[PDB]
Each structure stands twice: as C-alpha cells, then as structure tokens.
Amino acid sequence: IKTTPYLEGDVLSSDSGPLLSVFALQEIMQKVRQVQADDVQKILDDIKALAAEQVYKIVKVPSISFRHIVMQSRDRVLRVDTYYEEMSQVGDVITEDEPEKFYSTIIKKVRFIRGKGSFILHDIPTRDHRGMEVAEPEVLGVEFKNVLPVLTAEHRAMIQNALDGSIIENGNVATRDVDVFIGACSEPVYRIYNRLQGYIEAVQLQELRNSIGWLERLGHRKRITYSQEVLTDFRRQDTIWVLALQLPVNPQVVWDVPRSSIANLIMNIATCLPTGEYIAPNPRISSITLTQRITTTGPFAILTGSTPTAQQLNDVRKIYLALMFPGQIILDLKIDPGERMDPAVRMVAGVVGHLLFTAGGRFTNLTQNMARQLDIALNDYLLYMYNTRVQVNYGPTGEPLDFQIGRNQYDCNVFRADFATGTGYNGWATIDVEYREPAPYVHAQRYIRYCGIDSRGIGMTYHCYNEMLRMLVAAGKDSEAAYFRSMLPFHMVRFARINQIINEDLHSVFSLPDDMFNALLPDLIAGAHQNADPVVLDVSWISLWFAFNRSFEPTHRNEMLEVAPLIESVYASELSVMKVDMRHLSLMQRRFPDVLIQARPSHFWKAVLNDSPEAVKAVMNLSHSHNFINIRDMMRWVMLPSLQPSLKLALEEEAWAAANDFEDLMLTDQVYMHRDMLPEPRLDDIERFRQEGFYYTNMLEAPPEIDRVVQYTYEIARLQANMGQFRAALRRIMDDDDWVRFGGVLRTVRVKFYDARPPDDVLQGLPFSYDTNERGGLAYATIKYATETTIFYLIYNVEFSNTPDSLVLINPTYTMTKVFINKRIVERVRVGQILAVLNRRFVAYKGKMRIMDITQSLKMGT
Amino acid sequence: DHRGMEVAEPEVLGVEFKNVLPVLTAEHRAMIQNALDGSIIENGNVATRD
C-alpha cells in the first residue's frame, strides 16, 4: 500500500514524509511555544527511556567503605571512611536568597544517599582454607594494602590469621541455603540495605499472579496486536523475583495532578498513536487525462481536478488527528488579510464540513466561530444559483438558512448551529457513546462510535446524510446529489476505520476520564474552564475538500505499545515519590524553623522537580507553560490521599528516615573564625624530621567556649555591611582574640586531604564575599553570606624533604576559619583494632540462583 | 524575597530619599530598614484575573 500522489512544487511525488506521531509532537510544541511567545526524537526516546529504569544494583563485591594512612610508626595509623567524602562532594553552594537552590541541593543529597545505598549481592567469590569456606580479602568492606609493607612481622601475622578467620557461615533463610558472613559498612547505606533485604524476603507471588491476570485481561481486549506470554519457563525453584513495581496502576493518582491535560495528551500521542497512509476513494484517478475529470462547469467541477501540496497535506493530517481526538483537539480557520481565492472553495468547504465534523450531542470538536462561518458559507452556496432560477421564500431575520427553498417548501433552518443537540452536524438525533463491559481501565468505560455504526457495513446510511440528501434534492442540484450518493461508502468505511482506531488502540491510562469528558462541553459553552483545557489548531480552506477526498488507513503500529503499562507504572511511581518528597520537605521545615529557611509550595514543587527524569520534566514544563497554576493547586494536590506503593517509594521513605538527622548529611552551622599561626615543620634535622613528620587539620575537636565569642546572624551582617564598619568590627574582634560564629543558616562543607602545601584560597579563604558597589548607591557594599568552604587535612610527604621548594610557604602567614562537626571523620587508631569496624552482617545468594523480574525482562517482545 | 514573603524593590515606591542615608545613625537606619521591608505584596483578583 502506497499513498496517493500529491504534487510537490512542480513534480509529482508519493512519499509519506515524516511519521504522524512526530508531526503531532512538533505541532503541539510549536503551538505551545506560540502561546508563550510574547526536539521530537529526543523527547520521544526520553519517554522511551522510562522503561529501562533500574533501582537495584546487582554487584560482585560490596563497595569499599574505609581506607588508611600511615605515619612513620607501627602502633597507630589513621583511618577514614569514604562515605562522608562522597556525601560532601556531591553538594552545591548555598545562599539564603535562593530557597529553590537550597532545597534542590537537599533533594540531591537524599537522592544520592538512596542511590548509593540501594544494591544487592548475587555472585560473591569464595575460597578454601582447611575445609572451611572463607571470604577473600577483596570482598570485605575495608581495603588496606599500604599498611602491609611497613608493619612488624608479629603484627602482620596476628592480623593475617584474623583476616583468614573470616569464614563463611552457611544458613537456611526462606530461600533455603545462602551465605552469611561479617563485614564493615557505613550506617545509613546499611540501614537502607536492611530495608531492601527485608522487602526482598517478603513474598507476594499472589500479587504476581494478579498482575499477570490483569496483563492477560488487557491483552485479550488488545487481541489485535498484543500477544506475549513466557509463563511456561518461569517456574523453577532456583530463581528469585524482585517486586519493585506494582503493575495494576490506579489512574486517579496520575489524573490528580493539576493542569496535566496537555501532558497526558502528549504522552498518549507518544505511546499509542499509530502510523498510516492516505489514499483516494478510487486510486490512480489522478493519473488519467484531466479532460475526463473536468466534466462540466460548476463549483464542484472547479474544485475537482485540483491537486494538493505540502500545506494541504499537513492540514489534512491535522484534520484527521483532530477527528481521532474529539475531546481535546479543536479547530479554527487560518484567516489572514492577504487572502485571495475563488469563493467556490469556501462554498464546497462549507458544504462538506457539515458532514465531516460533529457538533452538539455528547461531544463537539468545533468552535462556535467555525460553526457560524461554515453556516454562512452554506447560506452563500445554497443561495448561489448559476444554471437555474428557482423561487425562494425568506424569513423574518437575516440569520443564515432562514428561508424556505424548493417547489415544496423545505426548511433549511435546522442546520443553523445549535450546540444543545447539534442539528447541523453528525450528532443530530444519533447516539455516539455507549457502554458494553467493564473495561480493564476503570476510568475509560465509554465506547466512541461515529455515525452510530460498529466495525463488528454495506449500504447503510444515517440521519444527517439523509437530511443532506433532502436539502440537495430540494435544491435540485442533481449533479453533486448523484456525486455524494456514489461517494457515501468511502465515507462510511473511513469513519469505521477511525472508530476502530479510537476504540481499540487508544485504551490507556492517559485517556480523559468519563465525567470530565461529559463536562467538557458545558465548560466550553460557559467559557470558564475550571476543570480541563482543550487545544485549538489552525487549518486552511481546501484542506476540508482534500480531507473528504482522502482517507486514512494504518500501516505500521506504535513501537512503544509493548511496554506502555510498564512506563506508565514507572510514571505513577515517580509522581508518588515527588509528592511524598514535598510532604517530608514541609514536615522538615515545620520541625526545624529556627535554622532552616522558609519557602513556598511553588519553591518546594520546583525543588522536587529539578532532579527528575527528563521526559517527566519536559512534559510538566510544557503543560505548565501552556496553562498556569497558583498556590491553591499545590496546597490541594499535596492533601490528596492516594499513593502508588512501590519499592522506590519505600526506599525514599527510609532514606528520609535516615536523613531526619540533617547534620549527618554534611550540612552544619558550626563554622568559626579565629586567628592562628600556620604550623610548619622545622625541616632542619633531617633524621628527626624523617622519623617523626607532621600533619595538620583545621578541625575543631571540641565546640568553642560559650563566652569570649560573638555571633553574626544574616540580618545583623547585612546591617553592618550597609553601615560600612563590617571590616572594622571584624578586625577589632580579632585583635580582641575572641571567637566569632556565622550561625543562623545551613552551610555546605567540602572536605579535602593534601599531601603538599595547598593553594592560598583553600589555605586562608573567608566564609563570605564582600563587594563594594559603585558610589552613590542605596545599600553600599554588600555581603554574600555563605560561599565555598573546605575542611582540610594536611599530611605532608616526608620524601619531598630533598626538594623543599614545593613545601615551604616562603613567608609565615596566618590561618583562617575552622569548622566543627560531631561525627567521627578521620581518627588515629591503634593498629590492633583496625578490624573493629567488622561489625555488620552480610548475606549473599548462591551463584546458581537466577535473579530476575519478568515484567522488566519481558522487553524483548519476540 | 525577604523571610519568605514577596516585597517590592525600594525604587517602585515613589519616594526619593537617597541623599539622607549618610546622616542617619545605626538605630535610625535599622528602623527605616525594618519599616521599608515590611511592605509585602498581596494576591488579588480583578475581573477573574490574578
């Protein structure tokens, strides 16, 4: 099947061009850009990438959580855990002026801790020792190699046998035999690991069966193109399922998001709309000589014989798309002051639009403006008499069709537009919506049938076409009367195909709910759209005639139809995650008023949307750019009760549970400034310096004293900066040898170790920035209160004593601000209890086990 | 944004006072600042518009 030929400039062509879904996406984005104005493949595969989302990480070896530093001695060495470093390095700079940035950084913190903590062991290695199964050194949570070459032999033996004693313990958990041993791991990721393991040991095979059964339910409704089951090979005992997602989604949650009509429509286009081809009722007739086609004179004869081009083809497919989506896509005419054309095209378009479009009844896909102007076009056509002269009898008003025509007086005033019943269009006295059986989706019960027919028809007519025949035979235009009489079956089969596409392929979670579908028309009549918003597109004049002369038939199905339940379930899970994140942000703000910074629901929504999958971000952004929201919508949408339970939400909740201690997230307010001379090695006695060495840090091991210390909150800092005595006050208070505190807000802290002398900025930076704006201003010099601040440990390299050029600071200097934390970060520990961290239970599954989820593994689709 | 409320910039208000800033003391500028920053912006509806 090939498309009917259409002219391109001067040579005929028959190429289908770009895909219909791509055309829809680009037209919708162009329209919303025009609305706000005062990508298609990347958005499509960003939607597609929602399927391959992975929450859990199967891994050979658990992550290393410790490392060691040696300082010229055997009794004690430094230990540090890498979790705090990785927690600190993923932050962002904080100032009070942007709560958006502040809370987006907080959300990044909690997302990082969840993503780091979620993992699982499957195939860990084992070794042998005298018949006892022992874990190899590299599978443990502590890595040490630098300690080995330098320690004394007795210590080496005493740690080697203790390391060798880490034997495997064989136990019987509910999946029969697994492997159990001891290890070391940082606390929060261990807590979330325990939560994940507790979810794993939970059993919901009945839930799996229910999800399967709903899958065959939707499959037998979608029997036309859905056919896949691999259930036979599933039942082997040597297997493990992860139920990270619940498949029977609830559409109420996804339809609860305010002003999501545009996003739902665009996603439905992305995931369900099929690709087809356009053909004339009688193929190849554009190739015959034109003299046979142009039979005589007249408006219909003038339009017949014309050929369309790219603009008319695009408008025709626009008309078809608007006809496939009645409840959201509406049309208007493209009028501009440069118009000039023969009136016959407008006349015939006015005639055809009555048959092609439906109005009134239960749904309407036209505007009042089109209804009225199509009506005046029909009035002009029916008055237009060229080949005959017949009697007319007019009415009291100047409204269109207010007259009587024919030898018998026939009233044409019925097809004057009236949205209450839709007399002039296909909704006149004919049913369009009905109900048959409980659908798999509990919000899309309706069946949409055009002209009252069912695909499950030769020679049948309907009321509107009958009355069009009545008017045309009253007008005595027997030429186009016989033309339309012959043209009926083409229209009937095309509308049957459109009905089949609407009711079969489009049954998805993104369909508009039935109550809002019924309420669409009263809202349009009233003009105030409290509930939902349709979108209107521009279409030309002869596009109507060419649409009537063409048809649409499908050729290639939607490639994403196989994984659409999966992607929409992931979508609902993500929405629930965002909602619960907003909830806990509000709760944390209420919990900690004195030091945190208050904000708005709009800022909270922006913070939870800032880090989010790109397709979700794009569709929400375009929907909100099309239609705006207020604080009332956010406060309402938070208070709605429904949630979509998932492993993702459980991990988020437990991450928040670990993150209730907010200072554990490398955030603090305990920064201070006190002048201190920078310690340097004497570097005179080579042997003694080689034996001892030196290290340093700006750590505060203890909190500073309650007295001999001053405070600066942000308001007082601002007032003092506007005074201009800020530097003087600071210099005086440092001459006083008093401590100073910058408390009041949260500052992000970075951490760094250095084996050489660091640059001067990290050596002696300040917690703030000071800029003197131009003289004659209102506020004078200004303070940025919080900036980059780095806690640092200096550990020299004693080998560089041969070349002191890279270690000597030339001139002695003063050191700057110190930072306090309560958590133990870097600790000098005696060599004997370096294994004292070995305090966490680890369990692993056998290699022969097959760990898999059928729902995600089903993506092959063969 | 100040303390979580929307406030207009000081040039929107039709008062010109830039010349007298250096002659006020600490308390006077503190109280004039407290008075000026308290002019919050309120939501309203006119002809079903925000």
3-class secondary structure per residue, A783-836: EECCCCCEEEEEECCHHHHHCHHHCCCCCCCEECCEEECCCCCEEEEEHHHCCC
In chain B, which residues have their Cβ closer than 8 Å to the Cβ of A776?
Answer: 18
> CB-based burial of residue A809 (10 Å sphere; 0-12 exposed, 13-18 middle, 19+ buried)?
exposed
Dihedral angle at the C-alpha atoms of A780, A781, A785, A789, nearest 10 degrees?
A: 170
A198: three-class secondary structure by DSSP: helix
Q: Do B50 and A776 touch (CB under 8 A)?
A: no
**DSSP for residue A63:** P
Q: Are A608 and A585 in contact (CB under 8 A)?
A: yes
CA distance A63 to chain B (A): 42
Q: Which of B1, B10, B50 sits opposite A778 (nearest CB)?
A: B10
Residue in B5, B14, B10, B15 with CA at minimum distance from that of residue B42:
B5
Structure tokens that stand for A15 in this block: 């190429």
d(CA A574, CA A560): 20
Judging by DSSP bridges, how do beta strands A403-405 and A667-668 pair with one another?
unpaired
A857: three-class secondary structure by DSSP: helix
Q: Characterise A737 by phi-psi region: left (phi > 0), alpha (psi -120 to 50), beta (else).
A: left
Q: What is the number of CB-based contacts under 8 A between chain A and chain B?
A: 22
**Resolution to 1 decimal, in Å?**
4.4
Separation in Å, CA A470 to CA A382, A400, A461, A481: 13, 18, 13, 10
In angstroms, the first-to-last Cα distance of chain B is 19
CA distance B39 to chain A (A): 17
Identify the closest residue of chain B to A528 by CA–CA distance: B48
Structure tokens that stand for A536 in this block: 């209107």
In chain A, which residues have their Cβ closer than 8 Å to the Cβ of B29?
Answer: 719, 722-723
d(CA A544, CA A16): 19
Residue carrying the six token digits 């040898």 = A737
Q: Please give the backbone phi and psi of residue A568, each rounded to the nearest 5 degrees, phi first.
A: -75, -30
CA distance A598 to chain B (A): 6
Neighbours of A576 (CB within 10 A): 20
Angle at A229 between CA A223 and CA A233, to 5 degrees: 165
d(CA A642, CA A248): 14
A91: three-class secondary structure by DSSP: coil
Structure tokens that stand for A496 in this block: 């049957």
Q: Which of A598, A719, A776 sits opposite B4 (nearest CB)?
A: A598
Q: Are A669 and A745 in contact (CB under 8 A)?
A: yes
CA distance A454 to chain B (A): 45
Q: Are A264 and A510 in contact (CB under 8 A)?
A: yes
Residue in A345, A314, A311 with CA at minimum distance from that of residue A9:
A311
Q: Do B29 and A630 touch (CB under 8 A)?
A: no
d(CA A648, CA A654): 10
**DSSP for residue A703:** P
Residue in A319, A379, A264, A240 with CA at minimum distance from that of residue A626:
A264
User: A719 at the B interface (CB within 8 A)?
Assistant: yes
Which residues are within 8 A (CB) of A530 and not within 5 positions of it... i.e. 6 or more apart? A523
In chain B, which residues have their Cβ closer than 8 Å to the Cβ of A600?
Answer: 4
Q: Which helix (H) or strand (E) holds A677?
A: strand A676-677
Which residues are within 8 A (CB) of A188 and not within 5 positions of it... i.e. 6 or more apart? A83, A113, A117, A655, A658, A659, A664
A555: three-class secondary structure by DSSP: strand
CA distance B10 to chain A (A): 9
d(CA A721, CA A726): 5
Dihedral angle at the C-alpha atoms of A286, A289, A290, A295, nearest 10 degrees?
A: -110
DSSP characters over B2-33: BTTB-B--TTTSS---GGGGGGS-HHHHHHHH
Q: Do A719 and B30 touch (CB under 8 A)?
A: yes
d(CA A743, CA A669): 5
Instruction: Name the experimental technique.
Output: cryo-EM
d(CA A635, CA A630): 9
Identify the closest residue of chain A to B17 by CA–CA distance: A778
A235: three-class secondary structure by DSSP: coil
Please note each residue after which chain A is broken, C-to-N distance over 2.5 A, or write none.
38, 456
User: A593 at the B interface (CB within 8 A)?
Assistant: no
Q: Are A358 and A450 in contact (CB under 8 A)?
A: yes
Separation in Å, CA A707 to CA A334, A703, A726, B33: 77, 12, 21, 30
Q: Are A394 and A403 in contact (CB under 8 A)?
A: yes
In chain B, which residues have their Cβ closer than 8 Å to the Cβ of A719?
Answer: 26, 29-30, 33
Reported in sequence order, the residue ranges of A152-256 that DSSP labels E, i.e. its strands, are: 169-173, 176-183, 239-240
Residue in A26, A33, A23, A24 with CA at minimum distance from that of residue A626:
A33
Long-range contacts of A305-310 (CB under 8 A, 24+ apart): A306/A542, A307/A6, A307/A7, A307/A12, A308/A6, A308/A7, A308/A542, A308/A546, A309/A6, A309/A7, A309/A8, A309/A9, A310/A6, A310/A8
User: B49 at the A interface (CB within 8 A)?
Assistant: no
Angle at A231 between CA A226 and CA A235, to 5 degrees: 170
